[PDB]
Amino acid sequence: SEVAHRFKDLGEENFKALVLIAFAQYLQQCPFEDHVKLVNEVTEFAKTCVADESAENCDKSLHTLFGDKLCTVAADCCAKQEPERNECFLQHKDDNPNLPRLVRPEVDVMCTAFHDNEETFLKKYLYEIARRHPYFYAPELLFFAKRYKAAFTECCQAADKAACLLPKLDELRDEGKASSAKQRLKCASLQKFGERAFKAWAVARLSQRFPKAEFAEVSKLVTDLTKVHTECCHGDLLECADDRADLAKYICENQDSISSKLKECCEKPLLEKSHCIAEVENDEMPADLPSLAADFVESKDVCKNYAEAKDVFLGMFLYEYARRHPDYSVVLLLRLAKTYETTLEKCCAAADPHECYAKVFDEFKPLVEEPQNLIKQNCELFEQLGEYKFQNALLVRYTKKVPQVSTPTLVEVSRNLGKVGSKCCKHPEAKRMPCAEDYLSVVLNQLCVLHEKTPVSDRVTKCCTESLVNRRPCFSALEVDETYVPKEFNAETFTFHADICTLSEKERQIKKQTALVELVKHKPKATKEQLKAVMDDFAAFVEKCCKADDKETCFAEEGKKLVAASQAA
Numbered sequence: 113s114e115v116a117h118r119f120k121d122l123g124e125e126n127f128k129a130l131v132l133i134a135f136a137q138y139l140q141q142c143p144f145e146d147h148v149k150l151v152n153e154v155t156e157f158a159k160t161c162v163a164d165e166s167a168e169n170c171d172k173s174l175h176t177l178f179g180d181k182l183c184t185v186a187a188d189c190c191a192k193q194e195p196e197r198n199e200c201f202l203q204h205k206d207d208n209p210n211l212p213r214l215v216r217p218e219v220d221v222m223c224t225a226f227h228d229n230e231e232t233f234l235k236k237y238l239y240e241i242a243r244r245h246p247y248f249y250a251p252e253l254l255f256f257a258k259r260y261k262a263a264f265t266e267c268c269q270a271a272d273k274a275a276c277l278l279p280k281l282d283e284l285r286d287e288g289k290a291s292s293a294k295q296r297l298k299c300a301s302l303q304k305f306g307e308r309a310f311k312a313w314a315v316a317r318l319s320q321r322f323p324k325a326e327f328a329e330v331s332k333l334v335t336d337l338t339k340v341h342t343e344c345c346h347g348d349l350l351e352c353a354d355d356r357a358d359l360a361k362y363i364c365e366n367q368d369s370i371s372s373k374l375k376e377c378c379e380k381p382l383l384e385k386s387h388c389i390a391e392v393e394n395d396e397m398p399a400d401l402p403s404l405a406a407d408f409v410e411s412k413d414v415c416k417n418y419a420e421a422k423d424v425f426l427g428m429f430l431y432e433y434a435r436r437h438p439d440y441s442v443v444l445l446l447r448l449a450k451t452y453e454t455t456l457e458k459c460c461a462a463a464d465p466h467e468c469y470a471k472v473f474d475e476f477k478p479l480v481e482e483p484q485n486l487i488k489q490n491c492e493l494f495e496q497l498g499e500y501k502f503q504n505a506l507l508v509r510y511t512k513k514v515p516q517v518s519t520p521t522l523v524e525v526s527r528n529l530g531k532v533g534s535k536c537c538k539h540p541e542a543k544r545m546p547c548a549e550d551y552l553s554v555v556l557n558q559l560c561v562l563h564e565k566t567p568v569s570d571r572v573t574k575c576c577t578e579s580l581v582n583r584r585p586c587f588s589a590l591e592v593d594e595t596y597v598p599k600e601f602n603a604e605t606f607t608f609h610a611d612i613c614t615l616s617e618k619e620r621q622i623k624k625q626t627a628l629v630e631l632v633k634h635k636p637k638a639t640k641e642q643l644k645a646v647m648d649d650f651a652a653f654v655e656k657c658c659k660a661d662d663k664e665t666c667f668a669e670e671g672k673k674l675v676a677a678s679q680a681a
């Protein structure tokens with residue numbers, strides 16, 4: 113009995129949660145009520161199995177069981193067999209579910225709902241997040257849950273809860289968003305590019321954090337980790353949670369053979385342990401390390417070893433280069449690595465392999481410098497323009513590159529693109545390029561998935577599917593789409609009403625930024641000079657109409673003077 117197996121291992125609490133999560137992630141439209149129902153029905157069935165490990169259908173796989181229970185409330189999909197059925201659900205997850213924004217009631221009401229019924233208050237939190245982020249890292253979600261719990265438990269019995277809770281709740285919303293992004297990138301790697309891509313990443317990333325670990329150790333960690341994520345991304349939430357626990361055990365037992373910063377971590381609760389380990393800082397770089405050139409370019413056995421076990425060889429390359437380079441970003445390392453592989457591929461087929469791959473490290477020089485330059489700049493522009501204007505600039509810029517992309521997606525992706533600026537540009541010259549180029553891969557992945565749903569720009573497709581590591585470089589190359597046919601103006605699209613006045617300070621910027629998009633889609637060839645100039649008139653008018661007697665009509669009148677002056681420029 114599989115269900116029985118996992119249950120013992122996870123216990124009722126987590127098992128219950130994981131299953132709630134898996135359901136909210138497969139049927140994001142269904143109400144809370146119905147999920148909760150099915151979860152209980154399933155949980156009790158599991159109980160009967162622990163005992164009689166041969167009762168009803170304790171023999172069946174998780175999918176069959178989970179699938180049949182969802183099929184009692186959903187159709188094509190359910191009209192299928194396994195694994196076909198299961199794959200169906202996976203393909204129908206919505207990365208942008210049409211769901212109501214989530215508004216939080218006043219502090220008082222929350223604390224009351226929390227104190228009265230705690231389990232419910234938390235089960236609904238898990239539900240509202242699982243359904244919106246169908247790819248959120250299950251295990252990690254439970255961790256956020258606890259942290260969420262501790263938030264209320266502590267703030268609801270203080271002097272000023274509003275002052276105690278609201279902050280901790282924001283810090284969580286953000287970090288929870290950052291978390292979802294990363295895990296999304298992760299699933300994307302595996303699903304669109306295969307495990308070979310995910311592994312390479314893992315090797316480089318781990319090697320950077322565990323410099324003292326042995327290649328053979330890393331590979332093992334890498335092999336396990338993959339399986340963990342390969343499962344979660346595929347919806348095998350229970351086993352993913354199980355295996356992820358194992359891994360945390362193993363790492364803790366073999367501490368000395370891996371890293372010396374893993375002490376603090378292994379001395380705490382399961383959920384807090386895994387979270388801790390996953391975010392441990394890089395161990396101190398081993399002192400006397402030979403030169404890479406030695407075993408990787410000077411040696412004359414290069415092509416021999418490469419042909420023997422191509423992957424392990426490259427796998428070693430990576431591990432070697434990475435471990436002594438925590439100042440490099442995982443993608444950059446991956447590029448270099450990919451460059452090396454290409455060199456060996458063409459060189460090992462030459463008369464004198466050695467001469468050919470002799471200067472491969474000269475090839476690297478350009479690659480390391482480009483990212484460096486780009487950031488040095490844009491962060492020099494961030495320090496100047498400020499966050500908002502900086503997002504605007506990026507807005508103009510990306511719209512010009514891929515005009516087809518839907519206004520909403522562009523606005524979103526660009527706002528995020530601009531946060532990277534606030535996040536990375538504060539660090540020192542040295543720490544700038546990593547932060548930025550790795551974050552950019554998370555964000556740009558956002559653009560890629562949202563777009564994959566309803567493709568409209570071949571230029572976006574190519575850049576997203578050609579190479580995972582090269583994405584940022586691909587998009588940066590694009591300038592303006594010369595074949596784009598400019599859009600014709602729509603009255604409705606540029607009509608500002610008074611309802612924008614009630615909207616928060618940000619929701620406004622969001623409006624103005626959505627306007628700027630439409631403008632550019634209308635005037636591709638327009639210039640940054642004109643655009644700024646025009647943006648000024650608008651600002652000058654929201655203030656007017658919004659504070660001018662009983663006028664829901666100044667929106668039609670003041671807006672007329674707007675479009676008029678707008679059609680002119």
Ligand SMILES: O=C(O)c1cc(-c2ccc(F)cc2F)ccc1O
Nearest residue numbers: 317318321340356359360389390391
């Ligand atoms: O589930 C996870 O996200 C996870 C992550 C790690 C991990 C540890 C250290 C590191 F630099 C990267 C990691 F992914 C190790 C084990 C693990 O289960």
Ligand SMILES: O=C(O)c1cc(-c2ccc(F)cc2F)ccc1O
Nearest residue numbers: 486487490529530532533552587588
């Ligand atoms: O073409 C570009 O100039 C460009 C720039 C960025 C970018 C965003 C935020 C930042 F702080 C630095 C950047 F380089 C991200 C993507 C991109 O295409």
Ligand SMILES: O=C(O)c1cc(-c2ccc(F)cc2F)ccc1O
Nearest residue numbers: 305309312426446449450579580581
């Ligand atoms: O899209 C990509 O950039 C990509 C990259 C790799 C890869 C191969 C070898 C290597 F040393 C590092 C890599 F990232 C493997 C698969 C892949 O799709």
